[PDB]
């Protein structure tokens, strides 16, 4: 029955033409009246050391003072940002780790990697040591990103074209999101925690409703794999970083690509993308051994962070948006301000 | 200028750092080997002689070996490959009794051909620019039995030689070893396994000892 292929062509063309009709102007033309941010200088107010291998993940705590970092050595380290003191040093059962998560309440942490298992550790145990609270299994690929929702709910993304919403007490997959045609590499929850976004290794991003479990929108435009996704603080837009050495800004309600950020002197893709609290700044981490601070409203480049020796592996910004913690494969975590 | 509790926190942090450094020193004296193959090309048997990631820890002549098998992870080699960098060696198992065999997929494709392209992709990867390969050639006996009936020319329509096991095996080795385009930094310690004795681990031990000597000489700055 070849008719279904023609039908798919028909709806695809209808969607594309409706999208083209909807657009009337460009964000650059509308924004070409405001004063540019200028030139941002940031200094490493603190350097955190103690890892003996590459750093593969990092998540800021609920406050602006605690954070958690994972290394391929096989260690999860909890750092007190203000005084560089180490609060906890959890040894993992598998050294192949590619993700991290910090619970909003601060009671639990999450870990995962090539073992296809999401391990949830309890931080505040009355005995006085960190224990493995739970071990969730059911994925058939490497875990790429896990983010907490409540103290009793997590969302994971695997490399088998599948995202999942779990239930910590029962340990069962409450909901499964499928539809991607490649490995999912990033995940970002909405500020209201009612929906999220996933970027897969087929140059596509998808919008997911947590409770319903069905996709709502899909955005294309990239020409390579997608390595990182960040959500705008407004909750109605997001940013994608790809291996095409190009960032893009998508909007949900309009369902369009607003701006593209790229330069002729950049040839390596982005590995981590994160907005600022005001939304006027976008920080990206390349393989050029440095991080770059663009201007999300004018599509120019403002700042650079070149403290790390090797390339920027993971990047995040404080909840109040003053410090920027960036960890790299050369076993260093720099706190810029 | 420090409170009573803050000094105790600093003491705890220093103890944590001490433990981390001790763990790092203790975990840096084990030889790590990656394992790769094409299908069920004798990999299970090779592991027997000596989900996801499968780690096997064993000991030979006071040397501790950790071997990582990634057979389960089918999705995308490129994304997880960079995790294994700085490994002491890469074992590559090739079943050479498959010249007359094709995939379960009904694509006319002889098993070593995809093995050849997999070897080419792995050998010339930018991560493994100075990592030695310990290529093993398996199923020697079955190949020897089959070569009398079905000639090797069905796989290689260029070979001009007798249907004898020795020279056919030499041809296969020669056409599996030319793909190394980086002959200046890395080595290919080929071996004809499946002899069913305690000799594969000996070959691996010799290769890793040579790699250890080279790494020590590079570290000392004398070489």
């Amino acid at each position, epitope marked *: 029955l070849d008719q279904l292929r023609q039908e798919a062509e028909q709806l695809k063309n209808q969607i594309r033409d409706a999208r083209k009709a909807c657009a009337d102007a460009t964000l650059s033309q509308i924004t070409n009246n405001i004063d540019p941010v200028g030139r941002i200088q940031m200094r490493t107010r603190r350097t955190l050391r103690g890892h003996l291998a590459k750093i593969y993940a990092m998540h800021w705590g609920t406050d602006s003072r605690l954070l958690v970092s994972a290394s391929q050595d096989g260690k999860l380290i909890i750092w007190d940002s203000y005084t560089t*003191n180490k609060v906890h040093a959890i040894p993992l059962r598998s050294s192949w780790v590619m993700t991290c998560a910090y619970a909003p309440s601060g009671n639990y942490v999450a870990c995962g990697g090539l073992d296809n298992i999401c391990s949830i550790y309890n931080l505040k145990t009355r*005995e*006085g040591n960190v224990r493995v609270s739970r071990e969730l299994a059911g994925h058939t690929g490497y875990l790429s990103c896990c983010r907490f929702l409540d103290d009793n709910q997590i969302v994971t993304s695997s490399g088998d074209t599948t995202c999942a919403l779990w239930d910590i007490e029962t340990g069962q997959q409450t909901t499964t999101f499928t539809g991607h045609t490649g490995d999912v590499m990033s995940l970002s929850l909405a500020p209201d925690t009612r929906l999220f976004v996933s970027g897969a290794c087929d140059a596509s991003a998808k919008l997911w409703d947590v409770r319903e479990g069905m996709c709502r929108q899909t955005f294309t435009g990239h020409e390579s794999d997608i390595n990182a996704i960040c959500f705008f603080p407004n909750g109605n837009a997001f940013a994608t970083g790809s291996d095409d050495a190009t960032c893009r800004l998508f909007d949900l309600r309009a369902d369009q690509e607003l701006m593209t950020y790229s330069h002729d002197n950049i040839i390596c893709g982005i590995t981590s993308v994160s907005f600022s609290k005001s939304g006027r700044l976008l920080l990206a981490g390349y393989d050029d051994f440095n991080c770059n601070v663009w201007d999300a409203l004018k599509a120019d480049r403002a700042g650079v962070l070149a403290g790390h020796d090797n390339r920027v592996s993971c990047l995040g910004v404080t909840d109040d948006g003053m410090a920027v913690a960036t960890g790299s494969w050369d076993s260093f975590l720099k706190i810029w301000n | *200028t420090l*409170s*009573a*509790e803050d000094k*105790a926190a600093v*003491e*705890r942090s220093k103890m944590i750092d001490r433990n981390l450094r001790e763990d790092g020193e203790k975990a840096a004296r084990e030889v790590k080997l990656l394992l790769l193959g094409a299908g069920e090309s004798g990999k299970s048997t090779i592991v027997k002689q000596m989900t996801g990631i499968v780690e096997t820890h064993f000991t030979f002549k006071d040397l501790h070996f950790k071997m990582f098998d990634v057979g389960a992870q089918r999705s995308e080699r490129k994304k997880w490959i960079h995790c294994f960098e700085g490994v002491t060696a890469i074992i590559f198992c090739v079943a050479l009794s498959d010249y007359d065999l094709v995939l379960a997929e009904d694509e006319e494709m002889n098993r070593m051909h995809e093995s050849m392209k997999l070897f080419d992709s792995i050998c010339n990867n930018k991560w493994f620019t100075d990592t030695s390969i310990i290529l093993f050639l398996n199923k020697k006996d079955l190949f020897e039995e089959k070569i009398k009936k079905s000639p090797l020319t069905i796989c290689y329509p260029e070979y001009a030689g007798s249907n004898t096991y020795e020279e056919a095996a030499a041809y296969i080795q020669c056409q599996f070893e030319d793909l190394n385009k980086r002959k200046d930094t890395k080595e290919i310690y080929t071996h004809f396994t499946c002899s069913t004795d305690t000799k594969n681990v000996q070959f691996v031990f010799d290769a890793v000892t040579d790699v250890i000597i080279k790494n020590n000489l590079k570290d000392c700055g004398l070489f």
Partner: single-chain antibody
């Protein structure tokens, strides 16, 4: 199942020596600092000694400094107190207290059962003027403690602790850092105040809250206690 059991007490002739043993069970003893505290038969609590994790830091009270000794044995997770040349003022009840220090931790959370010893015959000072207050069930109660020095540090922390001791029971931690409640404590307790003047309030008073309340100065390792406020009838 995290009880601590202490032994070594008894009637002692003056000038003798003794060993006090605190045996632990059910927690990571190697990561907890340990304190030996003393309570007179009719007076309040008094700090005696402190040992850190790894035995890298040991502190003694000025009244017994150079006379007693402390030690810990991690593999059998047992705390030892060497007591020598006992005077007539060393008859008391000894408590073995655990405390772990990191960001957001709660020191002095758990207290031992206490062992009795009878013998035959600058520093911040914390005062509690209110000796006793008559309270009927169902009221709101206030307890005021005062200091001789500012307990507020430059980092914002105010090191003041509030403990409760029921009749014939070991002391229990109520409030740590003057504002944070301990685990398992009902929400009806609260604490506030500023430097040199702190106040603990209890709402909807119940039959259980009968006991003696003590304030605690943790800014210095002398760890001066208060006189204690009694609530009865």
């Amino acid at each position: 199942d995290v009880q601590l059991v202490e032994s070594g007490g008894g009637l002692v002739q003056p000038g003798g020596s003794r060993k006090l043993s605190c045996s632990a069970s059910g927690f990571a003893f190697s990561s907890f600092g340990m304190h030996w505290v003393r309570q007179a038969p009719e007076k309040g609590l008094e700090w005696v000694a402190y040992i850190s994790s790894g035995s890298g830091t040991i502190y003694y009270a000025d009244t017994v400094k150079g006379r007693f000794t402390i030690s810990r044995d991690d593999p059998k997770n047992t705390l030892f107190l060497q007591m020598t040349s006992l005077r007539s003022e060393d008859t008391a009840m000894y408590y073995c207290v655990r405390s772990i220090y990191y960001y957001g931790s709660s020191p002095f959370d758990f207290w031992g059962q206490g062992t009795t010893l009878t013998v035959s015959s600058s520093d911040i000072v914390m005062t509690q003027a209110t000796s006793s207050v008559p309270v009927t069930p169902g009221e709101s109660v206030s307890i005021s403690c005062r200091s001789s020095k500012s307990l507020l540090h430059s980092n914002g922390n105010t090191y003041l602790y509030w403990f409760l001791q029921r009749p014939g029971q070991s002391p229990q931690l109520l409030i740590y850092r003057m504002s944070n409640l301990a685990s398992g404590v009902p929400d009806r307790f609260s604490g506030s105040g500023s430097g040199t003047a702190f106040t603990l309030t209890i709402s909807r008073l119940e039959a259980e809250d009968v006991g003696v309340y003590y304030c605690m100065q943790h800014l210095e390792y002398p760890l001066t206690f208060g006189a204690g406020t009694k609530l009865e009838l």
